[PDB]
Amino acid sequence: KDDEEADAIYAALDKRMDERRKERREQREKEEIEKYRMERPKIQQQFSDLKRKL
C-alpha cells in the first residue's frame, strides 16, 4: 500500500500551493454571492411564504 500514501502527498502539496489566496478568494466570492442575492433572491425563498401556507 505504497501508492495510496503517495497520492495524498501530492494532493496535500496541491492544497498547500492553493492555500496562497484560498481564504482571500473564498471570502470575496461570499460577499459577491450576498450582494447578488440582495437584488435577485433565490427562487425557493421567493415561494417561502406560499410554501409555509400549504
Binding site: 505504497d2 501508492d3 495510496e4 503517495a6 497520492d7 502527498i9 501530492y10
Partner: protein, 91 residues
C-alpha cells in the same frame, strides 16, 4: 535534522537506472513516479531562466531532483545586479 546536498553522482546513477519501460526492475512505483510529472513546465521554466550567459563557460546550479529521476528543477532564481548585468551585456 536537515537534508544535505547529495553528491552529483547520485542523480546520474538514478537516471541511468531509469532506462525505459521495457526494463522489468521498476514496474510498481507508478503513483510516486508519475504523480510529479505534472510539474514538468516548471522544469521547463526553471532551467530556461537559469540559462548561462555568453560570458560563462560552465554554470553550476542547485538542482532539486525527484528521488526516482522523474523530474529535476533548477532550484535557483537568476538574481543579478542590474548595473553589472547591463554592463556585461554592453561588453
Amino acid at each position: 535534522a536537515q537534508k544535505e546536498d547529495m553528491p552529483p553522482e547520485h542523480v546520474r546513477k538514478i537516471i541511468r537506472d531509469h532506462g525505459d519501460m521495457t526494463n522489468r526492475k521498476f514496474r510498481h512505483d507508478k503513483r510516486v513516479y508519475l504523480g510529479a510529472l505534472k510539474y514538468m513546465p516548471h522544469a521547463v521554466l526553471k532551467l530556461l531562466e537559469n540559462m548561462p550567459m555568453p560570458w560563462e563557460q560552465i554554470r553550476d546550479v542547485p538542482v532539486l531532483y525527484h528521488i526516482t529521476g522523474a523530474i529535476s528543477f533548477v532550484n535557483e532564481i537568476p538574481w543579478v545586479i542590474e548595473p553589472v548585468y547591463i554592463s556585461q551585456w554592453g561588453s
